[PDB]
Amino acid sequence: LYMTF
Amino acid sequence: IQRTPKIQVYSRHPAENGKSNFLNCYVSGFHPSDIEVDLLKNGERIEKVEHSDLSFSKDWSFYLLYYTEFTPTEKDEYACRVNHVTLSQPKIVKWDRDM
Amino acid sequence: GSHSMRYFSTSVSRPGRGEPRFIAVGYVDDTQFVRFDSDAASQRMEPRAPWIEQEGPEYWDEETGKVKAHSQTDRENLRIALRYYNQSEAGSHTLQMMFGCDVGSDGRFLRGYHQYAYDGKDYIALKEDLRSWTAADMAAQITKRKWEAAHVAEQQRAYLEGTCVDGLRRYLENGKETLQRTDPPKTHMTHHPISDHEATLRCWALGFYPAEITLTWQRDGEDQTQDTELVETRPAGDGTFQKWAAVVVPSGEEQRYTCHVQHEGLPKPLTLRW
């Protein structure tokens, strides 16, 4: 079963 | 960072003339990921060669398996040719039945 | 024993070639199970192992949804990284990410991982406490402050303690016959004279799973560490692994050397002698 810098 | 590939070329099973088999070229420990890996039969590039999905180790360096089905004979020579930014000319590693 | 699940992903920017290539792969222990390739025609998460195909298309619909979202995030992260390091748009750059969990033999959560590398070096990583971040440089410290303020760690801990562990337990039972198997190494020795007075002894381990193994040469019981030639463990391509170890011995003294093979599929360590 598999926000920015 | 730049890391040169480690290269191993080898058969899935110990080679027996006339018995079908798989020829492998395993490249690992390299960065960046763009690399070209060809399997050669008597100097000639083998046409149908598959490879594993790009993955990497705990230290972030990449590894790939290139492979093709083949039937060894006593006369035929095989090699792997690896082309990577860290290499001024492609490295050609010959297949040795005992390595 | 213990088990682990890992998702790996790589993003490589190619400025004149269009948008970055994104490749993700999942693993249970040493066995790959899923893959996604952004350049592939499918645009789906695809099965790479027999035991994962029995999942329904709602699993696949959700998994390719989440992996597609990841490729978009890491694409924007590649551009943010260019700004932070003040790098030109000419160059190709790489963003790697790993995440996943370990469980014990009773299936309990042991460890979890969420971490990134930029151009092959550590960028930011979640600590073992799963509340704090390790920033590797000044650029990563900006990301750390941003994620501390947004409480990113709490989300990841929830995923890593809950969803990751449940996925891993399920795959382990559904794939019990391949994944909980143990294949012992098939071993043998080769012997080649290299001169009048010297010969090579090579000790082979073939067809073993999982990859972890130890091959050691001794002379009269003394470890030959510095004098042993050793190759990295390598995949055979059928799901098993191979390794060998070699020493150069004086001709006629072959019987003084022993090769020792330890693997978790062997009842007891193996000793080979030419």
Author numbering:
A (entry chain E): 1 to 2, 9 to 11
B (entry chain B): 21 to 119
C (entry chain A): 1 to 274
What's the paper's own text on this?
In this study, more than half (54.5%) of the subjects had the HLA-A*2402 allele, and M1 protein-derived peptide H1-P25 (M1 99–109; LYKKLKREITF in pH1N1) with HLA-A*2402 restriction is 1 of the 11 peptides. P25 is conserved between H1N1 and H5N1 (named peptide H1-P25) but has a dominant mutation with substitutions at position 9 from Ile to Met (I9M) (named peptide H7-P25) in H7N9 and H9N2 and Ile to Val (I9V) in H6N1. Peptide-MHC (pMHC) structure determination indicated a molecular basis for the immune cross-reactivity between pH1N1 and H5N1, as well as the lack of cross-reactivities toward other AIVs, especially H7N9.
Due to the low resolution (3.3 Å) of the first data set from HLA-A*2402/H7-P25, we collected another data set which had higher resolution (2.3 Å). In HLA-A*2402+ individuals, we confirmed that peptide H7-P25 could induce lower cross-reactivity than peptide H1-P25 only in pH1N1-specific T cells.
